[PDB]
């Protein structure tokens, strides 16, 4: 999910 993409990104 794009939520998980942001979690990794952050």
């Amino acid at each position, epitope marked *: *999910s*794009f*939520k998980e*993409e*942001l*979690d990794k*990104y*952050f």
Partner: antibody
Amino acid sequence: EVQLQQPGPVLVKPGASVRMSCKASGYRITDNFMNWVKQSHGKSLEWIGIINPYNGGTKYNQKFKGKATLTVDTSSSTAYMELNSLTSEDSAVYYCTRVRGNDYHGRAMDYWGQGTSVTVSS
Amino acid sequence: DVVLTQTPLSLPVNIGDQASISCKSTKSLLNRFTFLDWYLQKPGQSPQLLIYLVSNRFSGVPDRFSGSGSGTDFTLKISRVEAEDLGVYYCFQSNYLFTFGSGTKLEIKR
């Protein structure tokens, strides 16, 4: 004190590109993420993208991929946004913001530049 | 995109009265930590942070401003409204693609 310094209003031609800048003062630019935000007619706020100034890594609002490109120059503590293929829909105020970080800080936007008001006109 | 529906979008209040803005989201903003913020834009200024992490007051912000809620439902309350509190209030999420609410225009009725 922390300050985000953006240039004042600019006039650019339709079809051209424009690169706008955001100079960070009072902190190390690589210690924090940065968001860029578009405000149309003083009303609607819209997230453009986020950049990690230490990595250069970016994430974009889908509507702005291919339209906006975020970059940083760490040696001059300056963030940049370039908009391409300009149209009258791109006339807006563009804000650069400092993002506190993840978790306890809430990914919140704690310091804001004064914005660059872009007029797209021939 | 997750939509943040604010109600009301227009909010007349007497000075000294309580103002309440609802922000409803189509998807839960819980991250595990809930990323819901409140921003204010006063006429002619940049947006400024009021509340982060649903309920934490940012520095220099008076305690008349309070945030609450969980999952998809959230509230910003101004306990005793002052003249200088006029502006547009925005909720903002960063659990998914960052989105803002449409903004609530707080006007002073007199």
